[PDB]
């Protein structure tokens, strides 16, 4: 189909075929974010999004999500990070190291509607130049199934205090999780391809990039970075080898989530952002220019 451009994003085609006799149909949850909003005047934001996580949880410690850290301006969804002088102290845990730290305020967004396979979800985003995680992801309301489109750390600071090296700003984590809630277990793929690096050593922080996933069926994901298929996750052995879904696969409809996180396992090793690093607000702002969603339908 050779038709006139209607949206910002039409300069970029959907990087995969919709299937034999099918075409892609844009879903109304898609947003180009070309309007103005903040927590006091949500207006157009409120038609598709809420400015919190899908449940009343403030996030992985020492993250503390705040509604007023979300806004839309200058053609982007903007998520900021700050830390007041008076911020509360939170107990942070990972493994069984244990540490009291100051909280880190940031933001989280959740879609008003859900998606389910078959579906292509693509964000055009500029990863924050921050030790904070910049995240675009999907999670079922019962917290048992998750598809991660973007999980990335954009800062050059990658050394703990110690004993670890951490994945750096040349990587995007392309993953998914399956969970049992109680007693708690987490599966994700664990192979080198899950931490995506391109051949040129692209530092993703430096510009806007398209990252999307084709959630094709419950045993097939395909990840696309700037229109190129860079990782295929196919079959029971890599989707759910421990049988946490009892054979269903990735089958439950999901909320779309966009946020930043000061993640516990990183924060406990010294990668929480310093008060000095947070003086520069552009560095600790995650930007999403747009997010688009297509499903296959009959031609
Ligand atoms: Na935009």
Author numbering: 43 to 341
Sentences from the paper on this structure:
determined the three-dimensional structures of these four agarases. initiated by GH86 or GH16B, which generates NAOS. depolymerized by GH86, and systematically saccharified by the exo-acting GH117B and GH2C enzymes. exo-acting β-d-galactosidases, while GH117A and GH117B are α-1,3-L-neoagarooligosaccharide hydrolases.
BpGH16B (pdb entry: 2AWD31) as a molecular replacement model. the β-jelly roll fold typical of the GH16 family. a root mean square deviation of 0.966 Å over 266 matched Cα atoms. GH16B, indicated as plus (+) and minus (−) subsites. (gray) of the GH16B catalytic groove. GH16B to release smaller NAOS fragments.
